[PDB]
DNA sequence: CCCTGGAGAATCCCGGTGCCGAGGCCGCTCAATTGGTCGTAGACAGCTCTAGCACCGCTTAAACGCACGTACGCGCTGTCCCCCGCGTTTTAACCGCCAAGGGGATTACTCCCTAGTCTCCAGGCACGTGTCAGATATATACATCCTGTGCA
DNA sequence: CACAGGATGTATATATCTGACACGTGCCTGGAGACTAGGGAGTAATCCCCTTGGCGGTTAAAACGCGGGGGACAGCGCGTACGTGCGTTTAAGCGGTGCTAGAGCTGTCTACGACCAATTGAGCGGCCTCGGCACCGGGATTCTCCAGGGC
């Protein structure tokens, strides 16, 4: 019984099946997707942390995440991602 | 507000080129330099305005400019 | 009618401007340009004098470095005259 | 079948091969797969050709038969097949990609042959094609090649759909019982499917007797004066002692401590910096700095004033190079048989050393070079510079000169050193050799 | 009694681990405190980026007449799109190759 | 009489072939020997996993490919078709290396 | 006393291999002095990366260099690599 | 009672604030915990770098026949040193100017 | 009153008086030096944070600082800085 | 002829002006000192497995060396037009000053959000396993490049 | 100079084979539900500072025009270094031996070093003041560049 390593592979596969119903992905491509998700996560988290430090705040919030997204992503991606995050936050708040 | 880029004059561009260390300047290079300056300024001001709006302020600060330049990879010493 | 050969005055200007340290663009036109560019991203933006000074410093440094690379490209092409093709080559090799 | 058959041509068989043929026929009648351990020099290929000819002629079953041989014996086997039993139809698979495709399309796929003789590499290359044929008999020569499982050749040869199987190995037991179990698992997968004095020995003999046939090269020739062995101990030189202590502690990067102690017992110059400076001289530095070389330097002149014709077997070609330098210094006559010697050069060197009248005095061989060939009859003295983990390798080295063509007793001088890795190497080899004797010789 | 467990991903309609994102943010030393909606926002952004890159990669794979996605398809999708190329301008994809691009001067004429 | 292609058709054909493929164009064992030799200077008694050598080879090949692309751009700038050490040096100078 | 040397390991990066790399880069004609320059630049790049990777491995108090150490060194140099971690 | 206060800066023979560096490390969200030797080591490194730069700038200012140091002197010192230039290779110093360097082909024949 | 502002100015001045006894500094140069000190502090601290995360440890120690200095500073600067830090830590251990 | 003279620009040496750096005081907040705790990390022990060193045998793709010819780099030459140096006129930057008011910075209060705990249990991870997508080989069919030949 | 044909390279169906991917199962550990405590941040109020708008006068800098020489660019010729193809050689790649330790990985134990809290006193930041260094201007030198022996 090896130790547990956590990867985003399951969720990447769910997204892939939602986008293209009948397609696959190899192990190397899944490794690349996991690395891409980790890199983007680290970029956004670090930018939000620096925003919180600059404004002299101790809490990372949805405002900080939105500002970090607009600072990192280039334009059309930025606006679409901002809309998606706002939709998810509204659904989470109105649901439970 | 228009034609403000033409406020960046040919003598000023020539002075910048002389500090860079160039001798002969083609006549078509002034508009190209204006475009380069425009895109650079647009990127920096966009990031600075993002920081200013996050701070809920209406005034752009030298610290906002420095943070923008730092995240673009152009650290500036002398303003905070 | 004393007259200098075409290129000695340019070298004198090169030397003096490389020894000097002041800004080489007019402050009021630069400030008007900065405000006009900021007109697109948000209305009624006020600027500290330090902010415009720092923007001018960064812009001049960037342009001087670009001109140095452009001069290198022109000398590589066996020319003494810098051209828009030289500027474009410098941008492409830098990664812009 | 107490008498030699009739399908054999070009001479009649003898008692030992006729008895081997009887044993193999009984094995086929009982439907068992087995091992011939007749030892090199008794006619295993002759017996196998006899068995295949018998199965073709007396039994009306001309079928797809395969013989797996090392590439170095393909031509000898084909010549024997044509000579002894010209009745059979034999086809060989060797060559480049285009030659292999041409051969398979022309002869193999149409299917007008009886025996297919292929090498191990050609079996690995053409496994997909070879797996089609409804294989009847599978004779694997040098069965100790597949003695290890988890190996690609072993699994490929197991995956064939075969009916009758046979192994031809002179050393069924090399180190331990795992490899013997692997060979027996290839023979009869169901009988042995796990892991192999009154608790042992007797049970092993009663299990193995219906599956193994072995006769030593002593009940047929009554010749070949008996082997003589001298185990000569060697004192460590002073530089060897210093490097031994240094390596015992731990700039030279040393990864395998055992593999450093081993050459350190051979010669310090094999390292970097133990050799003297730039002058690159070759005058008595080699002899004095190595105790084994001092002993050998004393030993060689006596044999040379006597029978001479000495063979030196070593496990390191660097040590072979040092011995070449020594031979040039002493102006002896040397021949180098190494793993880097091309095939044509080997045969010419062997023939030159085995001429009726030669001036050659030293033949140097790597302990694992060549393999199951190499005729060296003029020799009388065998020197084992290094001892190996597997004692059967040294047994093969010392029977390369101890063959039917010899007339004088072979004196095997084995160099060992006190309180070194050589002691434990020789102890391990002796344990393995005693296990081999107690298991196989009965 | 004890209400049934409903995942925050299901609450926000996401296919990404909101709880794992929250734990990573808390354990990564980015701030002392983390908001409730920040992990949801970040998970949604990651989901959108994954969807974009995977859509382009699937288009490329169908264009090459294959069902499985390979790093060559990923590199082809990352290039040929300006926004993703800017986002991943300094990233090397293993077993990705380069784009087909021959300078018009080199073309014979 | 024997057929022969003009000097430059095979070059374009190879350009297309290697821009279609994805495998590594440097030999594995020579690259591994180079990596070990370089590591011996920085520290002795160093062992390398197989994945580390593969990662180094991928990164090195990518760097060399990008360098050659910028070098070709500089050569085209000089109204040439051949690439030269001058082009390599100019590319490195502008990139900042 | 018998020893010999084969070749320098930088020469193992062969001229045809450099030609293939230039083909992927999109190069038609290549000078004869390019190979020395390419060997030099590759050696510099490898030296920097391997030094950083060895620093990481020494910090972790290991004697084996790992793909993760290589990835960290590349990310420090600004050459993020996807696929090995 | 308590003994006289002794700063860790003096206890380590330094001129930079060890306690201030410790507080900045604690409040910077760099880790959960901070060792005792880390502030001392970091203060020593910072002091070494500052002293090196200041010595170079003072030599430059003396070559300019001035007492006070200005950004031009700082830029000259930084760009005239290979290692400091590499350290500050992506940094712009305000009111620094550029080094005097004219290409040889542009000089008069 | 205006909130207090921290800077390294007094310590930079002490170092300057130590190295060049009779050389002064200006306000712009002091701003530049303060920015430089903050920048180097941030770089080293971030490198040590990443090292601590890579090795999965909760403490930043002198080993982390030394490794980060070896990573960031080039060559002779790294060697001399490592020596100075080792000396300071030895003095602190002995004299405490 | 290259060397001489004229002319402009750069440099060096003195003398009056101003503002900025250096010093000297006061308060307050932040760092130092003790005491107490616990959890991280050092230290140890057991296990397993990949890495390493020195070899053998074999196949075969790739490197290496060689000779030919051909585009291509490189120098030279001529043309002309574009860029530069200089004088003149004009426009707007620069500086100083004044006036007003938006907005940045600080403070106090309260509440609402989040950290931390403890159950509880379902999602995610490791382990086996079998079938299909892709890799390979092979024989056609098609597109491409190169040369010769009536054009000359 | 524009086709015809030849020889070669390349895309195309098609059949085979394999090994990795997608799936199922069991378990376990980290995430969700319910809950309490506390302090960070939102909100409102106030103060003063620093940004913006406007005006007048100076003057340096920009715009414009002109005249002319030097640089860019095209064309041409050459002799030379590199691509192309071919015949030989070599080492990479693959498959095996033969060992031991070795180094990484996981599970326990315990101690010492970092956090937390209260208290307190110097160190540091901010506020004033003042003289000396930088600066500005002025005047006598020395270097350099451009005609002219085509001085
Ligand atoms: N038919 C034979 N009868 C007797 N001795 C033989 C025969 N064939 C070969 N030998 C001897 O046996 C030695 C090697 O035999 P080997 O090659 O094992 O025979 P096979 O190839 O039939 O197994 C040779 O030196 C030769 O002298």
Author numbering:
A (entry chain H), I (entry chain D): 27 to 122
B (entry chain F): 22 to 101
C (entry chain E): 38 to 133
D (entry chain W): 168 to 363, 377 to 430, 443 to 634
E (entry chain G), H (entry chain C): 10 to 118
F (entry chain A): 37 to 133
G (entry chain B): 17 to 101
Article sentences:
Here, we use cryo-electron microscopy (cryo-EM) to visualize the continuous motion of nucleosomal DNA induced by human chromatin remodeler SNF2H, an ISWI family member.
In group C (guide strand movement, 30% of A-D particles), the direction of SNF2H movement changes compared to group B structures: SNF2H rotates downward and outward, away from the histone octamer, while the brace helix continues its outward movement. These movements gradually pull the guide strand of DNA outward at SHL3 and correct the distortion at SHL2 and SHL3 seen in group B structures, while preserving the interactions between SNF2H residues and DNA. Mutating brace helix residues markedly reduced the chromatin remodeling activity of SNF2H, supporting their essential role in DNA translocation. The DNA rearrangements in group C structures relieve most of the histone distortions seen in group B structures, though some distortions remain, since the DNA is still pulled away from the histone octamer surface compared to the canonical nucleosome.
